């Protein structure tokens, strides 16, 4: 029944404590300790906005990775001197 | 001298006792045998001898 | 060559550590006594110690205080014979040995 | 909390600037004149700590079977006793510090069971006496008995001997008083009339600074507590 | 302006408390972290000690 | 004089307000603006985080997708005609 | 007495504290985004290529293995 | 708010004009005598901030499991501790404000939950004690307990070492008092009969200016608040 | 405050008492640092022998008895 709860044990990777949301100091120090994450998000916000804009396309492309895996392997044979294919259609 | 405290008998009852020096709790006396080392010091050369 | 310089080969040793005293670090000074007794396997009966080095006499006071601390550590360890390094420096700087004042 | 070297430099720059003690570059006090400054500083610190009640310390004393007078000295401390002379010490310094001999006045004594023990009360048989200002008596030592002594303390001795206390712990407002006392001591010891007048000036400055500090209560010396005799006497 | 560590049960108001921490600070000072280190992991020490003969 | 930041709930005279701003000023001073900048644009962050699986996978096939992209114009190659010829 | 004024903009607990709590209660999203910045940077780099592929996603599949077999056939 | 070079040039062009400290152009003080002026300036700032109560500052202290004494020193600050000496700090700082220890007197102490804690009350079990002016005591530390200390503060230390504080924060009515104190120190240090007569004048000028500022209450030192004991005593 | 979290006599004193009542175990362990360190030195060999405990014995007396018989 030894108690281990304290401000010393807490690190920046720990999750929040549901009991101590009411304590204002706990929430304020919770936000203050994890400023590297907020700064990392803030410095690169344009990239996140662009990715959010292009989200639908990425969404579509995700269902079709498996086919592209085989198509990428086939590409090397698929080259086949593409100009020859017009003649092949002719013949 | 905490190490001496740990590794010691520290029992008051002892067989050693000097009759020539018997005193109560009132008496306090500094020993006559002062213990002091000798250190290196540069001569002053301002105090002319 | 560590193998050749072991106790059965040579009767006694003389040890010098000037860099520690000159730099004044004084925390790694106890290592030399341990090295002499154990690593080289020489008895404490025959160990000779040389203390201190004072060049550029304008730096006498700090180095001689470091020499005092080193001599204190050496006396604590129990070395039989101890040497100030040189006659020239000792006579030039006027080193004398006296009990410290009590105040 | 500055070391003794900072004190020497501040003296070399402040008062005693014009004197012959200071080195040529005005950086530090000369070597042969340091014990004088150390003695003066110790005297000044004892004066201030006697006047102001800035430090409150504590000590733990264990009771032996045949001893009644328990002098509070460093000889009987765990961290400082000599095993050959003293077989068993009764002052415990297990955790930290070394208990420098700094007993000015004894305020409270509490038993190991949480009960207070009266001091210097003739008509109370279960009281503790002090035949000397730092010696403590209990006339009925018992087994498994320990006393806690709460006393007013003074600043530990400064020695500058590679084993003494280098640091000085004093409130920041009381530095000029210490410097004025040191300057007074020096200029008095000079033994000339002009230096005597300067010493009078410095002593008066010391007194005025101490009185100002008392006026504004910067050390929080005044103490006021909640009334407890209202209920004891039976009032409603 | 000081509280004596041996002045436990000062409850003239009988709040409840005992204030036994000052004695711990007075005797076990700056080394309490080792005590908590050992106290947290007592089951492992107990299990190791129980099998001492075999070991 | 001054007001102690931890002296929240001083509302003895009237019940309203708790005065929680001084703690924010004391602990997160000069960095509140970054917090507000992130907080205003939080829906985008939530949407991006919700898709950290798909968006994660694509990071893995990026070189392959670039190699495929290098031949996008050629990948159509009008398959119908040579398919009909091969059917013969 | 009461200085709250408009309830829509002014919060009883405090504007700054309200924003701080709003961020605190939703930290896992920020942590998940921040842990992977090096990965979302590459997608931002290759956004143009991904958009170009998206245009040809509808076509260019054509059950491509069937086309390979037809070439073999 | 002005630099310390403005202070040096004000001294070079005010009092101490006729002295030999100043440079030939009388625009700044020579490099040899700057430490003396810095020491005198720090002494004067401490005197004024002790007398007038112009700055009120704050400290946040976190409580550990096994500690009852919490000295307010920079050794335990988060930005300034030594990791090997101190395992865990308990004084919360910021990278910009590194908490130079400037505690003169402690006024209020408030819990993290918004309830005030009695200070130096002997008869209250749930009170905080200060054995020394810069040390706190809580005899019952608890989990998730944090204390806010509201205290009177002094001016930060002037150092002129590219890391110390160059600036001076002082109301513009108290500049002649600071200059007069510096001139008093400098003229006493000369040890001549005429310089002492000038120093007496400068010290008296310092005192008269301080008394005038108290007389007109230019720092708004006097404070009055509404009466709350009318309701607590049961009056109608 | 919190009943489960905070101990009424004192957190530090509660931990100290808890350690005090369980002193014989710590003493028994501490008397034998050398033996436990020696055991820890040869843990891989002991694990390897454990993996071969069911086999590799075969009543090794029977092994040379079979040559005798």
Parallel, antiparallel, or unpaired for β H146-153 and H103-111?
antiparallel
Record the tokens describing residue H143, joined without a space. Answer: 């989990």
Q: How far is H85 from chain A (nearest CA, A)?
A: 17
H39/D14 touch (CB, cutoff 8 Å), yes or no: yes
Put simply, whether D38 touches C (Cβ < 8 Å) is: yes
Record the tokens describing residue F18, joined without a space. Answer: 């708790």
Spatial CA neighbour of F48 closest among A50, C94, H132:
A50
Q: How far is D110 from chain E (nearest CA, A)?
A: 6
Q: How far apart are CA E5 and CA E21, in angstroms?
A: 8
E21/H141 touch (CB, cutoff 8 Å), yes or no: yes
Q: How far is E41 from chain A (nearest CA, A)?
A: 10
Q: How far apart are CA D198 and CA D202, in angstroms?
A: 6
SS (H, E, C) chain H: CECHHHHHHHHHCECECCCCCECCCCCCECHHHHHHHHHHHHHHHHHHHHHHCCCEEEEEEECCCCCCEEECCHHHECCCCCCCCCCCCCECCCCCCCCCCCEEEEEEEEECCCCECCECCCCCCCCEECCCCCEEECCCCCCCCEEEEEEEECCCCECCCCCCECCECCCHHHHHHHHHHHHHHHHHCCCCHHHHHHHHHHHHHHHHHHHHHHHHCCCCCCCCCCCCHHHHCCCC
Q: How far apart are CA C75 and CA B7, in angstroms?
A: 24
Percent helix / strand / coil, chain B, rounded to 5: 10, 10, 80
Helix H or strand E encompassing C82: strand C81-84
Spatial CA neighbour of C22 closest among C49, C46, C48, C56:
C56
Give chain D's end-to-end CA distance (angstroms, integer): 51
Buried b (16+ CB within 10 A) or exposed e, I31-64: eeeeeeeeeeeeeeeeeeeeeeeeeeeeeeeeee
CB pairs below 8 Å between D and H: how many? 75
Record the tokens describing residue H74, joined without a space. Answer: 């920079």
- In angstroms, what CA-CA distances link H178 with D84, H7, H38? 60, 10, 12
Burial of A42 (0-12, 13-18, 19+ CB in 10 A): middle
Spatial CA neighbour of F78 closest among G67, E44, D93, A3:
G67
Complete DSSP assignment for D12-49 = HHSTTSSSSSB-TTSSSB-GGGHHHHHHHHHHHHHHHH
The set of residues, in sequence order, having a beta carbon less than 8 Å from that of A20 and lying 6+ positions away, is A26, H144
Record the tokens describing residue D129, joined without a space. Answer: 């006496």
- In angstroms, what CA-CA distances link D226 with D147, E23, H121, H130? 27, 26, 7, 17
Helix H or strand E encompassing D61: strand D56-62
Q: What are phi and psi of C28, to 5 degrees?
A: -95, 0
Chains with ≥3 Cβ pairs under 8 A against A? E, F, G, H, I
CA-based torsion, C84, C89, C92, C93: positive or negative: negative
Count the Cβ atoms, other than its own, within 10 Å of residue E37.
9
The set of residues, in sequence order, having a beta carbon less than 8 Å from that of D176 and lying 6+ positions away, is D205, D209, H43, H47
Helices (H), C1-103: 18-23, 30-34, 60-77, 87-93
Record the tokens describing residue F25, joined without a space. Answer: 């000023």
Q: How far apart are CA E38 and CA H213, in angstroms?
A: 62
Apex H124 CA angle, H119 and H125, nearest 5: 105
For G59, the closest chain F residue by CA position comes to F76
- Long-range Cβ pairs for the range F5-11 (8 Å, 24+): F5/H58, F5/H148, F6/A25, F6/H60, F6/H110, F6/H111, F6/H112, F6/H114, F6/H146, F6/H147, F6/H148, F7/H108, F7/H110, F7/H114, F7/H116, F7/H148, F8/A24, F8/H114, F9/H114, F10/H114
Q: How far apart are CA A50 and CA B34, in angstroms?
A: 85
Residues on chain E bordering chain D, Cβ-to-Cβ distance under 8 angstroms: 1-2, 4-9, 12, 25-31
- Judged by DSSP in three states, A14 sits in coil
Residues on chain I bordering chain H, Cβ-to-Cβ distance under 8 angstroms: 1-2, 5-6, 10-12
Spatial CA neighbour of D90 closest among D126, D150, D125, D141:
D141
The set of residues, in sequence order, having a beta carbon less than 8 Å from that of I13 and lying 6+ positions away, is E20, E21, E23, E24, I7
Q: What are phi and psi of D95, to 5 degrees?
A: -80, -65
Experimental resolution (Å): 3.2
Record the tokens describing residue G50, joined without a space. Answer: 């991904």
What is the experimental method? Answer: cryo-EM
Q: How far apart are CA D130 and CA D116, in angstroms?
A: 16
For F29, the closest chain A residue by CA position comes to A32
Spatial CA neighbour of H121 closest among D55, D231, D230, D222:
D222
Record the tokens describing residue D201, joined without a space. Answer: 């000036």
CA torsion, ordered B29, B33, B38, B44, to nearest 10 deg: 60
Complete DSSP assignment for A19-62 = GGGS-HHHHHHHHHHTHHHHHHHHHTHHHHHHHHHTHHHHHHHH
Spatial CA neighbour of H73 closest among D220, D6, D1:
D1
Q: How far apart are CA C97 and CA B43, in angstroms?
A: 9
Give chain A's end-to-end CA distance (angstroms, integer): 88
H144/A8 touch (CB, cutoff 8 Å), yes or no: no
For A26, the closest chain H residue by CA position comes to H144
Chains with ≥3 Cβ pairs under 8 A against F? A, G, H
Residue E6 has, within 13 A of its CA and on its CB side, a CA count of: 21
Spatial CA neighbour of C42 closest among C8, C1, C82:
C8
Helix H or strand E encompassing A72: helix A65-78
Contact list, F85 vs chain A (CB under 8 Å):
88-89, 91
Record the tokens describing residue D126, joined without a space. Answer: 């279960």
Q: How far apart are CA H160 and CA B11, in angstroms?
A: 61
Q: Note whether H106 and H119 are within 8 A (CB).
A: yes
- In angstroms, what CA-CA distances link D65 with A91, D78, D118, H168? 123, 18, 21, 64
Chains with ≥3 Cβ pairs under 8 A against C? B, D
- In angstroms, what CA-CA distances link H224 with C72, D12, F1? 65, 46, 11
Q: How far apart are CA H81 and CA I36, in angstroms?
A: 38
The set of residues, in sequence order, having a beta carbon less than 8 Å from that of F17 and lying 6+ positions away, is F11, G3, G4, G12
Record the tokens describing residue D156, joined without a space. Answer: 């530990």
D162/C103 touch (CB, cutoff 8 Å), yes or no: no
Burial of D11 (0-12, 13-18, 19+ CB in 10 A): buried
């Amino acid at each position: 029944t030894i108690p281990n709860e304290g401000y010393c044990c807490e690190t920046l990777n720990d999750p929040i404590v549901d009991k101590m949301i009411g304590n204002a100091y706990y929430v304020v120090k919770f936000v203050a300790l994890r400023m590297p994450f907020i700064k990392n998000v803030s410095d690169n916000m344009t990239q996140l906005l662009a990715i959010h804009n292009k989200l639908t396309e990425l969404s579509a492309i995700y269902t079709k990775l498996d086919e592209l895996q085989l198509i990428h392997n086939n590409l090397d044979k698929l080259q086949e001197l593409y100009n020859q294919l017009s003649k092949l259609t002719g013949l | 001298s905490i190490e001496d405290y740990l590794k010691g008998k520290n029992c008051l009852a002892s067989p050693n006792y000097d009759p020539d020096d018997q005193h109560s709790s009132w008496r306090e006396d500094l020993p006559q045998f002062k213990k002091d080392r000798e250190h290196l010091t540069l001569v002053n050369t301002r105090r002319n001898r | 060559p560590e193998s050749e310089w072991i106790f059965p080969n040579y009767d006694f040793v003389q040890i010098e550590d000037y860099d520690w005293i000159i730099d004044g670090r004084l925390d790694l000074v106890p290592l030399t006594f341990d090295a002499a007794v154990n690593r080289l396997g020489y008895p404490l009966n025959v160990v000779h110690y040389f203390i201190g080095f004072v060049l550029l006499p304008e730096d006498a006071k700090k180095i001689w205080a470091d020499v005092d601390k080193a001599w204190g550590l050496a006396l604590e360890a129990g070395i039989p014979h101890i040497y100030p390094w040189s006659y020239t420096q000792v006579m030039r700087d006027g080193v004398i040995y006296a009990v410290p004042k009590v105040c | 909390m500055y070391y003794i070297e900072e004190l020497f430099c501040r003296l070399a720059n402040g008062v005693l600037n014009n004197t012959g003690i200071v080195t040529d570059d005005r950086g530090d006090i000369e070597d042969d004149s340091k014990p004088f400054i150390i003695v003066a500083a110790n005297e000044a610190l004892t004066r201030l700590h006697g006047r102001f009640n800035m430090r409150n310390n504590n000590v733990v004393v264990e009771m032996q079977e045949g001893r009644t007078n328990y002098p509070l000295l460093a000889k009987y401390a765990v961290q400082s006793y000599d095993p050959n002379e003293v077989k068993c010490p009764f002052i415990m310094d297990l955790a930290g510090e070394k208990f420098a001999e700094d007993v000015i006045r004894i305020l409270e004594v509490y038993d190991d069971k949480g009960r207070r023990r009266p001091l210097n009360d003739r008509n109370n048989p279960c009281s503790l006496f002090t035949p000397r200002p730092n010696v403590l008596q209990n006339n009925a030592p018992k087994a498994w008995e320990v006393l806690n002594v709460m006393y007013q303390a003074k600043h530990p001795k400064l020695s500058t001997a590679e084993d003494g206390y280098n640091e000085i712990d004093i409130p920041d407002t009381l530095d000029p008083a210490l410097d004025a006392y040191i300057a007074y001591r020096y200029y008095t010891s000079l033994n000339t009339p002009e230096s005597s007048a300067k010493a009078a000036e410095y002593l008066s400055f010391y007194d005025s600074i101490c009185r100002e500090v008392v006026e504004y209560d910067l050390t929080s010396d005044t103490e006021v507590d909640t009334n407890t005799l209202f209920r004891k006497r039976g009032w409603r | 302006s000081g509280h004596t560590p041996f002045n436990t049960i000062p409850n003239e108001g009988y709040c409840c408390e005992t204030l036994n921490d000052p004695i711990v600070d007075k005797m076990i000072g700056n080394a309490y972290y080792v005590v908590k280190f050992v106290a947290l992991r007592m089951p492992f020490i107990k299990n190791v000690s129980d099998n001492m003969t075999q070991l």
